[PDB]
Design an enzyme around this catalytic site. Sequence first.
Site, PDB file in Angstrom:
ATOM      1  N   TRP A 279     -42.699  47.503  10.735  1.00  0.00           N
ATOM      2  CA  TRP A 279     -43.309  46.223  10.438  1.00  0.00           C
ATOM      3  C   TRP A 279     -42.585  44.996  10.964  1.00  0.00           C
ATOM      4  O   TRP A 279     -41.358  44.888  10.890  1.00  0.00           O
ATOM      5  CB  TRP A 279     -43.491  46.090   8.925  1.00  0.00           C
ATOM      6  CG  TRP A 279     -43.835  44.705   8.456  1.00  0.00           C
ATOM      7  CD1 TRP A 279     -42.999  43.620   8.400  1.00  0.00           C
ATOM      8  CD2 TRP A 279     -45.101  44.263   7.949  1.00  0.00           C
ATOM      9  NE1 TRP A 279     -43.669  42.531   7.885  1.00  0.00           N
ATOM     10  CE2 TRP A 279     -44.959  42.899   7.600  1.00  0.00           C
ATOM     11  CE3 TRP A 279     -46.341  44.888   7.752  1.00  0.00           C
ATOM     12  CZ2 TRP A 279     -46.013  42.149   7.063  1.00  0.00           C
ATOM     13  CZ3 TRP A 279     -47.391  44.142   7.218  1.00  0.00           C
ATOM     14  CH2 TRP A 279     -47.217  42.787   6.880  1.00  0.00           C
TER      15      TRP A 279
ATOM     16  N   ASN B 271     -43.380  40.577  11.141  1.00  0.00           N
ATOM     17  CA  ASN B 271     -44.270  39.458  10.902  1.00  0.00           C
ATOM     18  C   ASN B 271     -43.768  38.183  11.601  1.00  0.00           C
ATOM     19  O   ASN B 271     -43.685  38.157  12.831  1.00  0.00           O
ATOM     20  CB  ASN B 271     -44.598  39.243   9.394  1.00  0.00           C
ATOM     21  CG  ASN B 271     -43.373  39.103   8.494  1.00  0.00           C
ATOM     22  OD1 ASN B 271     -42.557  40.016   8.374  1.00  0.00           O
ATOM     23  ND2 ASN B 271     -43.264  37.956   7.825  1.00  0.00           N
ATOM     24  N   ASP B 272     -43.411  37.153  10.846  1.00  0.00           N
ATOM     25  CA  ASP B 272     -42.992  35.861  11.408  1.00  0.00           C
ATOM     26  C   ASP B 272     -41.950  35.749  12.535  1.00  0.00           C
ATOM     27  O   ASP B 272     -40.863  36.329  12.466  1.00  0.00           O
ATOM     28  CB  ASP B 272     -42.538  34.950  10.268  1.00  0.00           C
ATOM     29  CG  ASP B 272     -43.600  34.767   9.207  1.00  0.00           C
ATOM     30  OD1 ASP B 272     -44.541  35.593   9.144  1.00  0.00           O
ATOM     31  OD2 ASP B 272     -43.481  33.800   8.424  1.00  0.00           O
TER      32      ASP B 272
ATOM     33  N   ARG C  14     -39.215  27.286   1.288  1.00  0.00           N
ATOM     34  CA  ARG C  14     -38.721  28.068   2.417  1.00  0.00           C
ATOM     35  C   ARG C  14     -39.112  27.613   3.822  1.00  0.00           C
ATOM     36  O   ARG C  14     -39.837  26.633   4.015  1.00  0.00           O
ATOM     37  CB  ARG C  14     -39.193  29.510   2.245  1.00  0.00           C
ATOM     38  CG  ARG C  14     -40.716  29.609   2.115  1.00  0.00           C
ATOM     39  CD  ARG C  14     -41.195  31.045   2.020  1.00  0.00           C
ATOM     40  NE  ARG C  14     -42.628  31.130   1.754  1.00  0.00           N
ATOM     41  CZ  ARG C  14     -43.203  30.774   0.608  1.00  0.00           C
ATOM     42  NH1 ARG C  14     -42.467  30.309  -0.396  1.00  0.00           N
ATOM     43  NH2 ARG C  14     -44.518  30.881   0.464  1.00  0.00           N
ATOM     44  N   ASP C  15     -38.604  28.368   4.791  1.00  0.00           N
ATOM     45  CA  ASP C  15     -38.860  28.181   6.215  1.00  0.00           C
ATOM     46  C   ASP C  15     -38.404  26.875   6.857  1.00  0.00           C
ATOM     47  O   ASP C  15     -39.230  26.069   7.293  1.00  0.00           O
ATOM     48  CB  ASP C  15     -40.352  28.388   6.498  1.00  0.00           C
ATOM     49  CG  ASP C  15     -40.917  29.616   5.800  1.00  0.00           C
ATOM     50  OD1 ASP C  15     -40.145  30.556   5.505  1.00  0.00           O
ATOM     51  OD2 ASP C  15     -42.140  29.649   5.556  1.00  0.00           O
TER      52      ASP C  15
ATOM     53  N   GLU D   4     -46.149  26.935   4.642  1.00  0.00           N
ATOM     54  CA  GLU D   4     -45.283  27.931   5.249  1.00  0.00           C
ATOM     55  C   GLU D   4     -44.947  27.659   6.719  1.00  0.00           C
ATOM     56  O   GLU D   4     -45.796  27.205   7.497  1.00  0.00           O
ATOM     57  CB  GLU D   4     -45.916  29.313   5.082  1.00  0.00           C
ATOM     58  CG  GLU D   4     -46.046  29.725   3.619  1.00  0.00           C
ATOM     59  CD  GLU D   4     -46.644  31.105   3.436  1.00  0.00           C
ATOM     60  OE1 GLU D   4     -46.253  31.792   2.470  1.00  0.00           O
ATOM     61  OE2 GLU D   4     -47.509  31.505   4.247  1.00  0.00           O
TER      62      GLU D   4
HETATM   63  O1  LIG Z   1     -41.135  37.444   5.650  1.00  0.00           O
HETATM   64  C1  LIG Z   1     -40.940  36.285   4.844  1.00  0.00           C
HETATM   65  C2  LIG Z   1     -41.746  35.159   5.456  1.00  0.00           C
HETATM   66  O2  LIG Z   1     -43.096  35.473   5.206  1.00  0.00           O
HETATM   67  C3  LIG Z   1     -43.816  34.288   4.931  1.00  0.00           C
HETATM   68  C4  LIG Z   1     -45.041  34.388   5.868  1.00  0.00           C
HETATM   69  O3  LIG Z   1     -45.904  33.271   5.768  1.00  0.00           O
HETATM   70  O4  LIG Z   1     -44.112  34.181   3.508  1.00  0.00           O
HETATM   71  C5  LIG Z   1     -44.388  35.415   2.746  1.00  0.00           C
HETATM   72  O5  LIG Z   1     -43.148  36.017   2.217  1.00  0.00           O
HETATM   73  C6  LIG Z   1     -42.484  35.211   1.223  1.00  0.00           C
HETATM   74  C7  LIG Z   1     -41.222  35.953   0.803  1.00  0.00           C
HETATM   75  O6  LIG Z   1     -41.575  37.212   0.250  1.00  0.00           O
HETATM   76  C8  LIG Z   1     -43.433  34.912   0.042  1.00  0.00           C
HETATM   77  O7  LIG Z   1     -42.782  34.083  -0.915  1.00  0.00           O
HETATM   78  C9  LIG Z   1     -44.682  34.193   0.543  1.00  0.00           C
HETATM   79  O8  LIG Z   1     -45.563  33.917  -0.556  1.00  0.00           O
HETATM   80  C10 LIG Z   1     -45.355  35.106   1.581  1.00  0.00           C
HETATM   81  O9  LIG Z   1     -46.544  34.490   2.102  1.00  0.00           O
HETATM   82  C11 LIG Z   1     -42.827  33.121   5.244  1.00  0.00           C
HETATM   83  O10 LIG Z   1     -43.060  31.969   4.422  1.00  0.00           O
HETATM   84  C12 LIG Z   1     -41.480  33.757   4.904  1.00  0.00           C
HETATM   85  O11 LIG Z   1     -40.373  33.127   5.576  1.00  0.00           O
END
Ligand SMILES: OC[C@H]1O[C@@](CO)(O[C@H]2O[C@H](CO)[C@@H](O)[C@H](O)[C@H]2O)[C@@H](O)[C@@H]1O
Length: 537
Positions: free
Chosen positions: A18, A20-21, A145-146, A200
């Site tokens: 996996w 993602n970001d 975050r971010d 985000e």
């Molecule tokens: O992988 C973490 C990263 O994922 C994002 C993607 O938009 O947010 C997700 O993960 C967070 C941590 O578990 C959650 O709090 C959030 O609700 C979820 O959408 C990024 O914001 C984050 O950096």
Amino acid sequence: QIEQPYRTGYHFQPPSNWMNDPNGPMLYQGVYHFFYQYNPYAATFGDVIIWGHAVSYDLVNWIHLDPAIYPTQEADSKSCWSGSATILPGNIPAMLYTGSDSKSRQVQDLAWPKNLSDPFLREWVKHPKNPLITPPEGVKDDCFRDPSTAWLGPDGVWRIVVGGDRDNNGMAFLYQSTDFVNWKRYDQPLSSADATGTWECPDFYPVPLNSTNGLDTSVYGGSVRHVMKAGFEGHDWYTIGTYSPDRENFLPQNGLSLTGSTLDLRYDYGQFYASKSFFDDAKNRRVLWAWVPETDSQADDIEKGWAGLQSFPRALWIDRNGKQLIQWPVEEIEELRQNQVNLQNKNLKPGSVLEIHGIAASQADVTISFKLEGLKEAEVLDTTLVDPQALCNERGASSRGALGPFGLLAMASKDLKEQSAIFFRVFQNQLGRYSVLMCSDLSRSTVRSNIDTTSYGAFVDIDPRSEEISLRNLIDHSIIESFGAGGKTCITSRIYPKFVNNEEAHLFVFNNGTQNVKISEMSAWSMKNAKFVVDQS
Ligand SMILES: OC[C@H]1O[C@@](CO)(O[C@H]2O[C@H](CO)[C@@H](O)[C@H](O)[C@H]2O)[C@@H](O)[C@@H]1O
Ligand SMILES: *[C@@H]1O[C@H](CO)[C@@H](O[C@@H]2O[C@H](CO)[C@@H](O[C@H]3O[C@H](CO)[C@@H](O)[C@H](O)[C@@H]3O)[C@H](O)[C@H]2NC(C)=O)[C@H](O)[C@H]1NC(C)=O
Ligand SMILES: *[C@@H]1O[C@H](CO)[C@@H](O[C@@H]2O[C@H](CO)[C@@H](O)[C@H](O)[C@H]2NC(C)=O)[C@H](O)[C@H]1NC(C)=O
């Protein structure tokens, strides 16, 4: 039987598992660095997420390295979430990311390369004082975050934004610092919006007016405008405006606060999220990366062993009209082009389908331009409040209009039992003004079950009277990236047709409207695989 028919040939993705970001993208000492949220234990999200790391000299061919940022302190003991890179004077890449501490709080941490003589920056060191920033007064521990890339004001003070929300109200919390270690929250957020949920991966940067180039994040001036980008309600939105560092004020050009409605702009109107950009000073361009989620089931991901793709890096700039952004695949992709098949001055009769032969239909770069016949015949439809996605889902390629649907059939099977239709429709309001709709009809992209085949659409801001409608498509197995009108309208699609398991894909040009349309020019190129070398352990 074909092995891993859904893996892409030229899109970034890890060997497996996996992802993602996109995180901390940057160009340092001639090397392009790419990081990303990664689960080293499964093809789904998990309790332990770390920063994957890869490097490249052209943004196309990559070398996978060992994870760069992972839990080592109390400040990020539970996970290392999204962050950004800022190269400080003295040439030090500084990485700010959100860590999940021992108390499960989202806090902002700092790290930097421990061996600057290593061109690949494999090893990183954490700052002893992490966390550098913790949730402000009335903000929940899991709504902060971010951090973005920082910008240095003329006063020698650094700025950054951190996403979050205060009582479900999206926030781009602004912080300042002179040494990049001690940060102080500014009184007011850089920007915000009511009832949007957590913002985000916010991004804030300048774009040069009347230019198709990029700018270092720290440039300001009257000939510059700023973009406030934020992800919320499942999509990446952005607004163009003016930034006053002195008052830490961002004023949207259209005076609107983001609402996540058809009133706001997006980079891409399909599967595209957590996008992040960085400045490339070698080519004076701003490059944009984005995570493209899977649309198949979780069981499918676990079964195939991986999940998540990154969109192909695109150059980003502001349109000459100054009201929207333009995106285009970075030129280095052109190096993957092999043989070419071209068509010119070709008429497409109503209800016709024309197959394009000689191209590797599952891995190609296709561009087509349409010359319209009899615009006045356009269906009358005022589109002032119309939702383009709803319209595309209601009227797929099988819904015949006057002008439209006409475009491409990608990742289609020989018999067309499975196909992905990227097309246009042309309408006119009561006063004779035309509007252009771009659709990615995925309704018949697969006969498989448990696959999100929702279609996507958006209006293209062009005048059909003096501009031919152009469309470029990056076809790469389970992903298709569509660019309408030179990048004015982008839509990324994920498709999982069943036929790809044992037979070749096909490519077609079609016109299901009742009006005739002409292909003035069409260029298709087979794309060779990008190279992905593993250099780990
Ligand atoms: O992988 C973490 C990263 O994922 C994002 C993607 O938009 O947010 C997700 O993960 C967070 C941590 O578990 C959650 O709090 C959030 O609700 C979820 O959408 C990024 O914001 C984050 O950096
Ligand atoms: C161009 O428009 C055509 C007209 O809508 C469209 O027709 C396809 O074939 C028939 C109509 O000719 C329809 O299919 C119907 O029958 C099948 C049974 O096999 C049903 O499963 C379908 O649900 C539907 O009731 C449809 O209208 C359409 N077929 C499908 C799969 O929907 C053409 O397909 C259009 N051409 C392109 C390139 O999209
Ligand atoms: C810091 O980075 C440099 C550059 O990559 C590393 O030097 C290389 O080390 C390997 C293994 O020791 C050698 O095979 C190479 O010949 C070295 N190249 C250079 C440029 O000297 C160095 O090892 C790294 N330092 C640490 C602490 O790992």
